[PDB]
Design an enzyme around this catalytic site. Structure first.
Site, mmCIF file in Angstrom:
data_model
loop_
_atom_site.group_PDB
_atom_site.id
_atom_site.type_symbol
_atom_site.label_atom_id
_atom_site.label_comp_id
_atom_site.label_asym_id
_atom_site.label_seq_id
_atom_site.Cartn_x
_atom_site.Cartn_y
_atom_site.Cartn_z
ATOM 1 C CG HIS A 144 1.519 8.231 20.803
ATOM 2 N ND1 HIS A 144 0.907 7.464 21.781
ATOM 3 C CD2 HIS A 144 2.103 9.265 21.465
ATOM 4 C CE1 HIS A 144 1.037 8.058 22.963
ATOM 5 N NE2 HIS A 144 1.769 9.149 22.801
ATOM 6 C CG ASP A 173 3.144 12.292 19.850
ATOM 7 O OD1 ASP A 173 2.133 11.998 19.156
ATOM 8 O OD2 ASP A 173 3.770 11.436 20.526
ATOM 9 C CB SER A 188 -1.080 9.030 25.521
ATOM 10 O OG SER A 188 0.133 8.311 25.694
#
Ligand SMILES: [K+]
Ligand SMILES: [K+]
Ligand SMILES: [K+]
Ligand SMILES: [K+]
Lengths: 682, 682
Positions: B64, B206, B617
């Site tokens: 992402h 991810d 993240s």
């Protein structure tokens, strides 16, 4: 652990039950000529199980089993259904119309007697070997004449087991004076009823309490003020010791149907016709209803109960189809049949293989009929409300049926929208040549336009609205009635439904005959120790352990739920997650008496690896010493495939902890006399 | 365990980290003058974290985080976004426009320097102590002139911590030639993206892979074909040892904002205005959209992405409100403030109490404004698409904005239905006197009829449909434009939004000033060991353990998910649960190489009790010896309240197992050169 065992099989299973922890002597659980724990289990009102829990005839069962009786006694003046009911003396216990509890006084293996009598039947393909009429004539003969005279309250029945390779005779003792004693408020009895249907974890206190009344000598008597509490031969001691992970547990009750002896081909049929069709059609119907109920508050009121009743078997089908897809059910049945076929070849006996191919061949042959049958039953007969509109002094008779059809929960607009979606699917699946005749008008008169066809039915039918009914009669034209588009729709679909049922009916008997042979093979080959007979509404035992499971990757459900769970789920706006205010205050004060664990947590429910099905509602759950530890009330959706193949790592019985039942009687009911009469042990 | 610690606090936390299992020497993790693990963490493109994982400048971050760059390089001819991307040689690694990685070369405590310089500011209420402009002028002064000349690629910045009671200066090294190397297919990178947003268990791989390029001497250089791989000072060794329940874990990265020092009154405001409003309004908006998307396949296509973006912060608010209601967040802040108030009374120091009452008083005073602000922002500015319709050669300029507004994902019919539901709620909550002026026409011109008002906007606006826009110009009347009901709606709401923002803005500063005093008290009283500074987009460490949790009664989530979980969730019809066919075949063959556990199960993700937030993240996750065991990518919704109060029994970081990243590189990518360049250790 696997199976729903005959009482007669207790000796065969005894070693295995002890390996799992059973400490009772075989004889105290069941014996043929004396008193045993079997004499405390009852068949409660036709379907449910219950249990005797005092020396004065107290009976525990589920709240959902007792619901009709609690509802019958409820008024807006005294709404026992919302508030609960607690009779504070025996004289305040309420009688109930047309109720029964049955005890199984005696069981006897009569296979020899029946196979001898069946030799008179000349025709090898007679279905008398399974005919309830014929078996009862054998029962009555064996019981002698004057049986009922010599045995107040007793009756006899013969049943077939193992596809007609075994027969038992039961002697039943029936009481009809069974009075309501105690019920928690619905908020407890039905906590999560719909949203948590078929769900573990579960938090429902699903119990009610009755008492068996009889004559001064314990004989069945019809209701009278001079009847007294039954003094039963055996009742359950109630444990306060609780349960721990891995504890032995066992259940007796009356499971209805299983399909343990399906062939691989019957599994494929069960998936691809029965379950796939119910899933597709109910998803359509549910999806239109939901959309309407969300859009309009009054439609949510009218339809939520039809919505939930649809979802009930829908959910069960999803769960069954999940097991077929993920748990290897078809393969298990393939392996069972190929084992017996290799074996038979070696014995020089081709009849087992021929039986399996007979079943295969019948399933193949009935395929399109069965599909048509399910499509029409799920799509229209159940799916479209106006399929059950009325079909023709007599106007007043018609009005009555109209009123029932268009009642206060019926919306013509919802019905039309549902019908449009269901018929669109139905017409895509069923070809013109096989349609009920009236549905050919969609193509022929409305150029494929299902909304126009359905609109026309309502526009012109005297049942399309109340004013349309009122104007019809008023001025009956008979004449108009014979052309009524709704009447002709209704008639047309029930005619096709009927004719399908009649052409399918005969396909059952070849399958039944081959299953006799199929099961006889299986039992000759491997014996009965690990091949239980299919459930047939008779008394069975099952044993297992108190144990959670993993539903999916990285998730575990434990063995025990608590009151902390109820409070977590509390929602005062949703009627199914209302918490009772006396139970709320109990929680806030930790007023748990002696019913909570040493750490102060209050149990609500537990689960176990026992093997149950429909008909085990209310079944007593016993510990290693046969003391009552809980009351069975549901099973998890991951386990519904277990009617075909038991799943050790998924299937659970969902059970109300008896400590929670005691808590509710004590702290919510205040009904102390019911605790003092029970035998509550450590 | 609790907190987002300064590098400078490592020594204060060291004992606690070792109690939890840390085996590294303090100096190897962070030190002020040498090389440490800190030199392998980067701030990736402004918000995300990443990490250096080879001696040739390879950088790991989330999928992402890399999404914009993968999407920029994707075409229908070479759709790297669906297929993944694997550069098979360094020369095939793709450059990216306007990208950066920042290393934190140096950190220095400059609190004394700043408090000395702040003494020049005469006004006691100046907000310069938090002004980014002012602090950068101090930074530049301290770094001397010629700093940038003497230090290729370096820059400096000062930041305030602990409400302005502490200041750090960072020296940052910025690379702008960062090239895309490797990305799994979106089906892996985004597996469950929407449905499983904020969910544990999680099954998403991810990750994406970049490389830092530079000059021959390792200096930052703008993109050129003559640049070469950076030879970094420190990179992470990659562990193949995996994780077990209770293993030590730690993270470094760049958390954005927290609110650890809220007063009780700010918690109540956060619940009752910010969260309650976002929840009510987004539930309305989401509920109309969903109803439309279900009814029409083309509307699901156009709106699913606006639908998911709404649900993102909606879900976060639900989770935060859950913690407030069930986990005691208000009470924790009440106790913090009353502790300091008893303490201050004893010290003979009333200023801590006065600061808390100042905050209280400001929150009380701004209440109705803030409520109006949130109502208009959630209800209209975000909630109604036509609020951002255009507001006025120049027709061609207008057309461009019209085209963007009424683009291929916009439905006027959905927009009207949304608007009707949102304005009905907005008008029930905001009284006539406080409405944006145009909304007074609902009462005044349309007699309360919000559907008629909204219908009229579209009927007469030149932006109500394309033909309406085309016919307007065509024949511009200027004249018609000044009366356009949409333009006047749009202007009117943005005018009220603006004026609310302006009247609220000043209320921030008293609160900020009192927080300086409030936090100074707290730190004098109890010290910094168990009172982390609020996150402010700077480098922080957090430590904890690999551990699942119980979300609710009788349910446990473990610490580790597996590939078995991915396959369980497989749905080929839903794009978020598509399984890649090479990963499917790997699973079927158990082609796991050395990446699976001894029992043959292949890990996908794990969770840990570290304390993270937005900005973590891509953060590296280290084991007891500082080797890389995973990459942080989300947190669970039960833990979103943790920005205000850490929840030990609920809050988890959700992390991709580095063994799964290796599996995907190897078996899905076939990109062996990337494994050989890493240092993969036992
Ligand atoms: K059920
Ligand atoms: K059944
Ligand atoms: K998220
Ligand atoms: K945050």
């Amino acid at each position: 652990d696997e199976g729903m065992w005959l009482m007669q099989q207790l000796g065969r299973k005894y070693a295995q039950m002890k390996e799992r922890g059973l400490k009772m002597k075989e004889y105290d659980l069941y014996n043929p000529n004396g008193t045993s724990l079997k004499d405390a289990v009852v068949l409660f009102d036709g379907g449910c199980t219950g249990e005797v829990v005092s020396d004065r005839g107290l009976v525990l069962t589920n709240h959902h089993c007792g619901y009709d009786m609690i509802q019958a006694h409820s008024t807006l003046e005294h709404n026992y259904l919302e508030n609960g009911f607690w009779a504070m003396r025996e004289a305040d216990e309420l009688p109930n119309k047309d109720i029964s509890v049955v005890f199984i006084d005696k069981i006897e293996d009569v296979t020899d007697y029946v196979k001898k009598e069946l030799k008179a039947i000349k025709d090898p393909n007679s279905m008398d070997y399974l005919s309830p009429k014929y078996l009862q004539k054998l029962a009555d003969k064996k019981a002698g004449k004057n049986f009922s005279a010599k045995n107040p309250g007793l009756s006899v029945e013969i049943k077939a087991f193992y596809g007609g390779n075994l027969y038992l005779m039961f002697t039943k003792k029936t009481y009809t004076d069974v009075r309501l004693v105690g019920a928690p408020p619905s908020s407890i009895g039905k906590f999560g009823a719909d949203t948590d249907n078929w769900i573990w974890p579960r938090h429902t206190g699903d119990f009610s309490i009755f008492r068996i009344y009889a004559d001064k000598n314990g004989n069945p008597a019809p209701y009278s003020e001079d009847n007294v509490p039954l003094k039963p031969k055996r009742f359950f001691n109630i444990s306060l010791g609780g349960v721990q992970e891995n504890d032995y547990a066992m259940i007796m009750g009356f499971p209805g149907t299983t399909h343990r002896y399906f062939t691989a081909s019957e599994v494929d049929e069960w998936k691809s016709i029965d379950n796939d069709i119910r899933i597709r059609m109910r998803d359509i119907r549910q999806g239109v209803m939901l959309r309407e109920m969300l859009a309009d508050p009054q439609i949510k009121i009218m339809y939520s109960a039809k919505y939930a009743a649809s979802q009930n078997a829908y959910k069960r089908a999803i769960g069954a189809n999940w097991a077929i897809k993920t748990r290897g059910l078809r393969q298990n049945k393939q392996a069972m049949q190929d084992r017996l076929i290799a074996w038979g070849a070696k014995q020089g006996t081709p009849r087992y293989e021929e039986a399996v191919h007979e079943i295969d061949a019948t399933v193949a042959k009935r395929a399109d009929l069965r599909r048509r049958y399910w499509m029409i039953e799920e799509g229209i007969i159940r799916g479209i409300e106006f399929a059950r509109s009325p079909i023709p002094e007599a106007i007043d008779k018609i009005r009555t049926r109209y009123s029932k059809f268009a009642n206060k929960d019926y919306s013509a607009e919802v019905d039309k929208k549902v019908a449009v979606a269901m018929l669109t699917e139905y017409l895509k699946e069923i070809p013109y040549e096989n349609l009920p005749l009236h549905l050919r008008l969609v193509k022929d008169r409305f150029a494929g336009d299902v909304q126009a066809y359905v609109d026309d039915i309502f526009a012109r039918s005297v049942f399309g609205s109340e004013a349309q009914f009122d104007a019809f009669a008023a001025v009956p034209s008979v004449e108009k009635l014979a052309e009524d588009p709704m009447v002709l729709f209704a008639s047309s679909v029930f005619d096709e439904y009927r004719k399908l049922y009649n052409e399918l009916r005969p396909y059952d008997d070849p399958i039944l005959r081959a299953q006799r042979t199929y099961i006889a093979g299986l039992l000759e080959m491997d014996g009965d120790q690990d091949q239980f007979p299919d459930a047939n509404l008779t008394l069975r035992f099952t044993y297992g352990q108190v144990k959670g499971y993993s539903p999916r990757d990285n998730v575990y459900y434990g063995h025990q739920t608590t009151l902390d769970g109820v409070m977590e789920k509390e929602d005062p706006d949703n009627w199914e997650f209302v918490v009772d205010p006396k139970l709320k205050a109990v929680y806030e004060r930790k007023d748990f008496g002696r019913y909570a664990d040493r750490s102060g947590r209050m149990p609500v429910a537990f689960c176990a690896t026992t093997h149950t099905t429909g008909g085990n509602s209310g079944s007593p759950v016993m510990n290693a010493n046969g003391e009552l530890i809980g009351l069975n009330f549901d099973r998890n959706w991951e386990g519904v495939g277990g009617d075909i193949q038991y799943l050790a790592d998924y299937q659970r019985s969902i059970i109300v902890d008896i400590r929670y039942v005691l808590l509710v009687i004590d702290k919510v009911g205040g009904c102390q006399r019911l605790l003092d009469e029970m035998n509550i042990v450590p």
